[PDB]
Swiss-Prot record:
Binding positions for Ca(2+) 2 per the UniProt entry: D64, D91, E101, D102
Expression sites by tissue: Expressed exclusively in hepatic parenchymal cells.
Disulphide-bridged cysteine pairs: C2-C13, C30-C125, C103-C117
Lineage: Eukaryota, Metazoa, Chordata, Craniata, Vertebrata
Binding site for Ca(2+) 1: V39, E45, E126
Keywords noted in UniProt: Calcium, Coiled coil, Disulfide bond, Endocytosis, Glycoprotein, Host-virus interaction, Lectin, Lipoprotein, Membrane, Metal-binding, Palmitate, Phosphoprotein, Receptor, Secreted, Signal-anchor, Transmembrane, Transmembrane helix
Domain C-type lectin: 9-126
GO biological process: immune response; receptor-mediated endocytosis
GO MF entries: asialoglycoprotein receptor activity; D-mannose binding; fucose binding; identical protein binding; metal ion binding; pattern recognition receptor activity
Nucleus listed as a keyword: no
Shown stretch of the complete protein: 153 to 281 of 291
Protein name in UniProt: Asialoglycoprotein receptor 1
Length: 129
């Protein structure tokens, strides 16, 4: 029951961009498709997303812009699945662009990193059947 060009996996529909956007723009894009930036809650979902994105930095629906880490659909962060690269998240200021790092993304090996929300990365939308 997914729209055309979306991939079905375990009762969810996924859309994989092939262009980049800043996190806020990617978030708005997903909402306009009645969807949300991907929310990863299991190792099997993590492996499925990794297969389709390949070795490319790609935004997910996890951020700490207003305080603590939150998933865009209200899924609890603390008790949920996490796949940070060791030493991440680190809220790095050293990029010199202003502020720390408030948006999560998959890195080239699948492990997560927090980075500057303005960066243009590919993104994934998800909707639940
Ligand atoms: C893309 C990526 O992994 N970026 C990270 C950045 O977010 C920050 O953690 C930095 C710390 O030295 O290490 C990397 O450059
Ligand atoms: Ca999900
Ligand atoms: Ca942060
Ligand atoms: Ca980081």
């Amino acid at each position: 029951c997914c729209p055309v060009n979306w991939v079905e996996h375990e009762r969810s529909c996924y859309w994989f961009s092939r262009s980049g956007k800043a996190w806020a723009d990617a978030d708005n894009y997903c909402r306009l498709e009645d969807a949300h930036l991907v929310v990863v809650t299991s190792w099997e979902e993590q492996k499925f997303v990794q297969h389709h994105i390949g070795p490319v930095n790609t935004w997910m629906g996890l951020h700490d812009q207003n305080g603590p880490w939150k998933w865009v659909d209200g899924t609890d962060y603390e008790t949920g699945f996490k796949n940070w690269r060791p030493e991440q998240p680190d809220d790095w200021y050293g990029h010199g662009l202003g502020g720390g790092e408030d948006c999560a993304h998959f890195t080239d090996d699948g492990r997560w990193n927090d980075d500057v929300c303005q960066r243009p990365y590919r993104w994934v939308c998800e909707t639940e059947l």
